[PDB]
Amino acid sequence: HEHCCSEEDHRIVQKQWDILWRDTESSKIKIGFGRLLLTKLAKDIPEVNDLFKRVDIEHAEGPKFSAHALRILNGLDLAINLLDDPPALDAALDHLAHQHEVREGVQKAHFKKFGEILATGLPQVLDDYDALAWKSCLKGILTKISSRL
């Protein structure tokens, strides 16, 4: 209810997250942004580089990774776009939990960090950003995704 992620709250997030996909070259953006986001993660926590090894994170611009950049960044999209349908969003995220559960090496502390990074990044590409609303929602998402251990 109050605790979790308000209608207005996400209605906001959703609106602000859309400022991004106004131009058809979403790929170039999603990639570049997701690329940077993951990079800046491996920067602060290297034990990550080995996890993303499978997707050739070594080559940031390498298609292998660029594709990945999308998948993840695009997953975040899914999460955000289902914010207005808790049961669905729930299911959608639970599924993401399982996709991370079987990937050993990935620990909670990783998400906590990725969250802080994401929160410092968004406001750099979006002129209109409501830190409070976002933090509220991103938390709920990141948590439910890593919930499965």
């Binding site: 308000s6 207005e8 409501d130 830190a131 509220s136």
Partner: protein, 147 residues
């Protein structure tokens, strides 16, 4: 936890009832009434304001102080819509109290109780909870710096 946007709106209004008039007079009596409740409960803190002459209630050297406090709060609330700036001035507000030797993390939790007991008396339709919630988020960040 966090602050909802609705809550911000609630406050952005609740405040417009205490602040409202251009006059010092009102805001003064309120902020004062707030401190009087802080001192009646945490009498130790009283001493901290000898610099502004609390021994002379109607001094003016002190009244002006009260106002500054009031206005400092006003400034906070009137920033709740600009997060990023609030987050910075909120820090700056901490530093101004960390360098004030004698200010405990407690005294703050104490002035918080103060408002929650005063405000509900100076105006009706006070969402004590909503206030409490966002006031704590504000205090936490202020105080914490100090210890």
């Amino acid at each position: 936890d966090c602050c909802s946007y609705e809550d911000r709106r609630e406050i952005r209004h609740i405040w417009d009832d205490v602040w409202s008039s251009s006059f010092t007079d009102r805001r003064v009596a309120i902020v004062r009434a707030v401190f009087d409740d802080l001192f009646k409960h945490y009498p130790t803190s009283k001493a901290l304001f000898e610099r502004v002459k609390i021994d002379e209630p109607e001094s003016g050297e002190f009244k002006s102080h009260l106002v500054r406090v009031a206005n400092g709060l006003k400034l906070l609330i009137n920033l709740l819509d600009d997060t990023l700036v609030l987050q910075s001035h909120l820090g700056h507000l901490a530093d101004q109290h960390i360098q004030r030797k004698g200010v405990t993390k407690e005294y703050f939790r104490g002035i918080g109780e103060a408002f929650a007991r005063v405000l509900p008396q100076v105006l009706s339709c006070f969402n004590v909870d909503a206030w409490n919630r966002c006031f704590h988020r504000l205090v936490a960040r202020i105080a914490k710096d100090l210890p």
